[PDB]
Amino acid sequence: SPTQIFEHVFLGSEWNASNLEDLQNRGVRYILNVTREIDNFFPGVFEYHNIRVYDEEATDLLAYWNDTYKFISKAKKHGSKCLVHSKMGVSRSASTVIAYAMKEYGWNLDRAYDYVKERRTVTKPNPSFMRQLEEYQGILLA
Template sequence: MTEDNSIRGLWLISLMEEAQAGDIKPAGHHEALLERSSKSKEAHTEDLMRRELREIMQSVDLEEVTSSDIRQRLEEKVGFVVKPYKDFIDREMLVIMGQLDKPSKIFDYLYLGTEWNASNWDELKGNRVGYILNITKEVDNFYPNEFVYKKIWVSDEATTELLIHWQKTFKFIKKAKYDIFHCCIY
């Protein structure tokens, strides 16, 4: 394991992407290699589209293009008709957009971000984050030895009751604000 936290963060993101794609298997190394080599053509096609789609979306101004424009560019890059994969591509575009989103600055001491923001070491350090309030049971604390975390174990659903956690979260944010402005902990 490396001491470079930015590399560790990329490694975690890479593992999450592989897990989403179904590439991580509990089998032994040799069995995993055999299983991977027998992946269906469909899975290889989706992997190719996922990689190319990410590259396209990182190279364009997402405010200036439509999903149709992106699908057309993807088709040009992969060299085959992607219409049968429209639903897959649309889902992947949403995932990639979530990963590309920057956190929203609420106050000088408070940002609102996604799982992808919470796993991006460079972004966290660049924004001088010292405390992370993690309100979901689906997302781990990525750097428990580097940041002060408060974990509220709730489902990430619209019907989840958050108000019952108000006092705990308010105290945590208040302490983070105090430490940032009075103790200079980053």
Template sequence: MNSLAQEIAGFSTSRLRKQSTRVTTASGQVLLETRSGADYHSTPDTERQSADTCGFVQDFSLDLQVGIITPFLLLSSQDAAHDIDTLKKLKVTHVLNVAFGVENAFPELFTYKTVSMLDLPETDITAYFPECFEFITQARQQDGVVLVHCNAGVSRSASVVIGFLMSELKMSFDEAFSVAKTSRPQIQPNPGFLQQLKTYNPA
């Protein structure tokens, strides 16, 4: 039978097996934390660094689903905005890009407007509405079809579309949100945008 001293020795840090843990910091840096006995080391994990960026898990699956809000107004992610077959099938003529850091894919084929905004609750999204709505209205007057997109087609572009329905088509927030949600079920404006839309009072 082992003595108490022998049992304690069995749990000594010098006898622990080497353990490694991957940690992604808020800035997106991937570290490999290694503990061997009483020693502890933290080093950059170059193997995973390129795959994990910005502190977010990347989704590499394509989202080509496009919400048809009205015959002239469409809502999508950047994936659909970069898919020429989707754009042609839906007869898109104008593209409103409200993403940040997303290039316009086919400037020679479509009329683009870029209004870069951040998907942060504290962003005053209503300050961007006038230039966005003007672009959509001009396209409509030219019998065009406008695709509004951000990165994921969930928050910024959805908020712009909901705001347009409220401002130009005189819908209430609930009506506009319902139209957008029915057309593209994955929409979910961030809490700050939702609050701004609920109190938005178009002139």
């Protein structure tokens, strides 16, 4: 299933994003699709935001986390829930979720990674995504 990380935040996969009834039942109405290659399965049912990026070292996700912040913050604003998903829900999605938590609750990186890793054990940002979260930390501070 998709993994609830905050009141308003789920972390999941493409197969979670294609499971309409699951999403509806969980009260999701916003979907953060952190992929280039996976579709928006239900346009007209959910509000989408797309981060059209591949799960590769050359991807600069850092440049997109305030956009991601904006959207997820939007979900909460209207009293709703957001699914953050990729293809596997392991790297692009997980990293994004970790960054939001750092920004949002002002959590240390190990703090947030640890928080997210505990609930979604398969979470595993790619090594370049890890470097960037460390940067993000430095940026949030400086």
